Amino acid sequence: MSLRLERDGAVARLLIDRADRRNAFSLDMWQRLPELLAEASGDDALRVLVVKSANGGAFCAGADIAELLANKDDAAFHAANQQAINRAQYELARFRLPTVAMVEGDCIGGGCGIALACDMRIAAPAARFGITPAKLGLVYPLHDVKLLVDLVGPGQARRLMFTGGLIDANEAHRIGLVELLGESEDALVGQLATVSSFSTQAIKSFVRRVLDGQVADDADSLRVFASAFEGADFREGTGAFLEKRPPVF
Amino acid sequence: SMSLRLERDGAVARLLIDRADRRNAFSLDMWQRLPELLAEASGDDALRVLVVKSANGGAFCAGADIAELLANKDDAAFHAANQQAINRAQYELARFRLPTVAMVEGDCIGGGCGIALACDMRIAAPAARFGITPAKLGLVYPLHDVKLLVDLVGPGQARRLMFTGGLIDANEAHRIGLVELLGESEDALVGQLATVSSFSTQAIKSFVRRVLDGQVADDADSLRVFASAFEGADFREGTGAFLEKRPPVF
Amino acid sequence: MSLRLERDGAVARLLIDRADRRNAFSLDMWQRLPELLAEASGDDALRVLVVKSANGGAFCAGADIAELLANKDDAAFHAANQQAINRAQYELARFRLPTVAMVEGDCIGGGCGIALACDMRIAAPAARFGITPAKLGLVYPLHDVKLLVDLVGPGQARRLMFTGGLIDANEAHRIGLVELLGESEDALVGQLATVSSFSTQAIKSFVRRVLDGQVADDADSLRVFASAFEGADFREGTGAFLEKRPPVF
The missing domain is CATH 3.90.226.10 (2-enoyl-CoA Hydratase; Chain A, domain 1)
Incomplete structure (x- = not known):
């Protein structure tokens, strides 16, 4: 093809x-x-x-x-x-x-x-x-x-x-x-x-919001930011940091 | 005064x-x-x-x-x-x-x-x-x-x-x-x-101005402007000149 | 500290x-x-x-x-x-x-x-x-x-x-x-x-308005511009120029 x-x-x-x-x-x-x-x-x-x-x-x-x-x-x-x-x-x-x-x-x-x-x-x-x-x-x-x-x-x-x-x-x-x-x-x-693919996908959406005219943080963008701390990738990041090894996302 | x-x-x-x-x-x-x-x-x-x-x-x-x-x-x-x-x-x-x-x-x-x-x-x-x-x-x-x-x-x-x-x-x-x-x-x-094409430059200049004025997406008007190009004399000159392997005269 | x-x-x-x-x-x-x-x-x-x-x-x-x-x-x-x-x-x-x-x-x-x-x-x-x-x-x-x-x-x-x-x-x-x-x-x-600190502060605010999505001058921005001519910095700027000395803003 x-x-x-x-x-x-x-x-x-x-x-x-x-x-x-x-x-x-x-x-x-x-x-x-x-x-x-x-x-x-x-x-x-x-x-x-x-x-x-x-x-x-x-x-x-x-x-x-x-x-x-x-x-x-x-x-x-x-x-x-x-x-x-x-x-x-x-x-x-x-x-x-x-x-x-x-x-x-x-x-x-x-x-x-x-x-x-x-x-x-x-x-x-x-x-x-x-x-x-x-x-x-x-x-x-x-x-x-x-x-x-x-x-x-x-x-x-x-x-x-x-x-x-x-x-x-x-x-x-x-x-x-x-x-x-x-x-x-x-x-x-x-x-x-x-x-982290959690990070890239969320950041990509933030950039798109900015390109679409969003000027300030709002309730949703604050929530997205806060949601990262509840996520598996953050747990892998902090766990890896404590063990002095690279994170595996 | 000059x-x-x-x-x-x-x-x-x-x-x-x-x-x-x-x-x-x-x-x-x-x-x-x-x-x-x-x-x-x-x-x-x-x-x-x-x-x-x-x-x-x-x-x-x-x-x-x-x-x-x-x-x-x-x-x-x-x-x-x-x-x-x-x-x-x-x-x-x-x-x-x-x-x-x-x-x-x-x-x-x-x-x-x-x-x-x-x-x-x-x-x-x-x-x-x-x-x-x-x-x-x-x-x-x-x-x-x-x-x-x-x-x-x-x-x-x-x-x-x-x-x-x-x-x-x-x-x-x-x-x-x-x-x-x-x-x-x-x-x-x-x-x-x-x-x-002066049809193209003028239309494109207006699109750029719409973007600078905050337009984010295509709308009915911008889709119409784009489609209107194919009905225009400049497009006919463009394709005609291409087939005849000569520069277009717009 | x-x-x-x-x-x-x-x-x-x-x-x-x-x-x-x-x-x-x-x-x-x-x-x-x-x-x-x-x-x-x-x-x-x-x-x-x-x-x-x-x-x-x-x-x-x-x-x-x-x-x-x-x-x-x-x-x-x-x-x-x-x-x-x-x-x-x-x-x-x-x-x-x-x-x-x-x-x-x-x-x-x-x-x-x-x-x-x-x-x-x-x-x-x-x-x-x-x-x-x-x-x-x-x-x-x-x-x-x-x-x-x-x-x-x-x-x-x-x-x-x-x-x-x-x-x-x-x-x-x-x-x-x-x-x-x-x-x-x-x-x-x-x-x-x-x-002029009158100028820098005013201009900084204009840049911020533009970053916040302002596309055209409005009454407020026209007013801010016009207000410069009544200010002490403009008087010092023109007075210093006439006296052929550096302005002290």
Whole structure:
């Protein structure tokens, strides 16, 4: 399959495997993505989801161009495609566990949307980023405009979206589009896999609350904080600390 | 008075600050003039990008006309009118319908920094310097402009600059996100901005403004705007040009 | 005297003085902090508050570990500690005057919280930063999640909070966690102490309104702006300029 899930204990990988079209997404792939997220989310052992190319190279060149051109006069297709992309983007960005995009090549348009929906991004030296709807007279979904502005601010967001020009790995790192430069996700994934999954999931939800406009602590966020002390992970943390050993979460 | 003037050149318009003998400092009449020139530029259907720059290079804008400030220091009526005129100019520049670029080649201070902040993006040449200096005279900065600054550089850097009134150079402005690009000239960027879809740039600019105004999710309107693109002439030109392996002419 | 306040005219110093526990905070230090803020705030001569270690080295290694372990099953302690930390953080972040954190060593967990609640941070070359609740199965308070996201954005915030990994002074500077690199706060403090305190206090409040979600000027903010022209600092600013002398605010 051109989009598949691999589950390897604490780590799952969402793999994009369509090298002959530079990992371009078709409508069926967009529709499939939420199903794979649901499969991954149902695994209690999972600690981190990695999104990456199955074969290195391009991360995702964006829209399937043959599909775009074949359906350029098809209103039903455009509506279905809009909904599928928006669903996929919405769900990926709110996946319960930490998510990492490993970008080793071109990450364009809808591909950039996928990367933006992950919690953090690692860029290898060949990585390139761009958002190109202005080159076809199209718009970017507001959900994804917000993901972009959240990371790089409105100046860089407009620079990228108005021009549709590509930027390289170092510039993406400089402007905050990617958090890390590196050849592999292994080191980061190792760190993410060993911490408390109670903590990561709760903190992830707090960050989302802040991004959705929450300004101060309220009764619920105070309760979530306090609930940690009743949890098994806190008991493992304190027990491990007393025994001078690493906690095993 | 031609201390602020508009040049319209097809797809590109230039809002030129032309008061070299006062280092491009703004007087009240220039603040009044600014939205009038924006209205003229906006009425042009052929326009694709507005560039804000010095007519003569050097200083972009050294801030408030100091002679005017001192002469009117006890004049409450002047202060009221000046506050409202500046706030109108800033508000309108920040919401200009098309892409705007500030080309900064020298000192960009106070209200001058306000103008640069109200553009969509900024390019800084090597001699560009930036500062917000109201704390040196016991003044405040408008909340609208505080927000423009915090949007770009965050509250730590915003407070560093506004509390001290100290200047930063082009490289530090670039590092903290006050300017998006370093360069001697706007020509390359303007060329890119002039040749993309103006349907796209205007719609996207409005989306970014909705996000900055606190919009969190897509709604009926934003979903409609997105869908409307496929009914547009620019999309038809885009796909037609792609099939013919030629550049689109939007 | 683990936490103490020095008042030196225009400059006050909140000094963390517990070197034998790497400046770790106990409950009583958290409770003492707002009392010292109230004392500082009552001084009309004050222009800037500096938060720093009394003895260089670590800024604050985080929670008093012996205290944490001794109270691991004490619900009353957890409630009191949560309340004290949140109050201290809330009040420090809203102190009426400019605040500067001078970080010369490790700044971890609750220590990073204190640093984040200052207006700006200077890091010396040995400074290191980390937020580590995920290593103990705990959450970070939403107020402090917001302080972090405000500075570094959601990507870097999640990188730091999910891994609990430390970053060095240069990376903290690169991602916007600290505003300045330097060995000493003296130059910055000199600059802050000589500007208008009418201006700094008013501007600080405007920045806070923006962080709390204010998007446009309103009657109140227009009024605050206009009120500057009736103030003694504006008269001193213009009078000094006319007399070609430095202003004395």
